[PDB]
Amino acid sequence: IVEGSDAEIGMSPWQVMLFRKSPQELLCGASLISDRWVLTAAHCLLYPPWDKNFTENDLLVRIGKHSRTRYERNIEKISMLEKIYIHPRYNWRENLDRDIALMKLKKPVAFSDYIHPVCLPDRETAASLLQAGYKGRVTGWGNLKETGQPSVLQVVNLPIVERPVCKDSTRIRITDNMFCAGYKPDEGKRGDACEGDSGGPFVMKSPFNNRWYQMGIVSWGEGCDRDGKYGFYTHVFRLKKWIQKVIDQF
């Protein structure tokens, strides 16, 4: 997170950390959607250009954290993966289209004041909130500047941007399963996700029932918090059906 601020305790009870066993290091961000399933970006697990191809036993899932490096005894919960599912049509070759993956935990995690699942949007909710100008929130333990890292979970509120503006800001072919967010060059305010925040949740609080819904997943960007450039996120509702399939089928 660039130009954000320290999150307050229990502010993102669904924030998950993808931790690599060896070497022990932050891999990606992720989110808890139920007591047995975590959602993240597919490029966190598979991305050939960088020789990345992790499997169930290469990593751990850490839920309920605040501090980036400390083992938060009695607060955080470390879980093991039983199965990883990458969207069958994930296009890592061209534009990172369909950058999504689901992870099944070995055992259900118990909720607490720091561990709680976020909601998945439904057609009605996505349509009401997914509008240009409406702000969302991104959280992560990633880099603070493009060129080091935070001690505590960082957070930023960012406005969703009109599809047109998103297209004309890059040479990469944008698709319907993506959306971008960030402040424009002349808006005075700034901020963005960055390396390390990948797979992290972009959420919005419904003004109708007071619940938090995950609308996107930190996917890609060109640099971090660069004027004229924007962050791109996986459109969670668009892939909602593949999510339901996977879950009630396995």
Partner: peptide
């Protein structure tokens, strides 16, 4: 990163 307990390394 602070080392995490061993009974998790699986």
């Amino acid at each position: 990163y602070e080392p995490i307990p061993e009974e998790f390394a699986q």
